[PDB]
Every structure is written in C-alpha cells, then in structure tokens.
Amino acid sequence: FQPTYGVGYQPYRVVVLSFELLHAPATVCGPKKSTNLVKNKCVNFNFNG
C-alpha cells in the first residue's frame, strides 16, 4: 500500500457484521426509542412490552 495509488488499489478497511438468530434468547437488541411521558390523559401505554 502506498498513498499515491489508484482508487482500485488503495487500502480499504472492511468490517462485516454477521447477524444470526439462534434458539437462545436474543440479547443484542437495538436502542428502542422512548416517547416522553404524558400523565392525566387516556393514552396507549407500552411499558417494557
């Protein structure tokens, strides 16, 4: 690798993420977004499922 190389010969760092689902409980979850809490109104609540 040299810095004066062409774009087809320049070094590229590659990270491959492999996602598998197995019968074990899935623990790598995404960051579920949280809506601000509203009180004293008839709302549809979803608390931890």
């Binding site: 197995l22 019968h23 074990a24 409980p25 899935a26 623990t27």
Partner: protein, 48 residues
Amino acid sequence: YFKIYSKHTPINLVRDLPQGFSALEPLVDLPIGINITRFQTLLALHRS
C-alpha cells in the same frame, strides 16, 4: 432463560435449617440458551 433467585438471611442457629418464612427475591436472569443436566458446588480451601 436461567433464573437466579436469592435471599440473604441473618440467622443464629448452629446446625440445621431454621424454621421460618423468607421469600426469595429474583436476582438475575441469564440468557444462556444451553442444556444443563448436572451441577457441582465450588468450594474454597484454607491453606496454612
């Protein structure tokens, strides 16, 4: 799911289990996903 429930109790009985009631709180749930059919306690030696 591996459920570990635990309770710490202050007792002063010498030999056997004391007679009483103490409900065990849930401490930790472990995502293990493995087959378990046998177990073994781990102790600690005292060296001098």
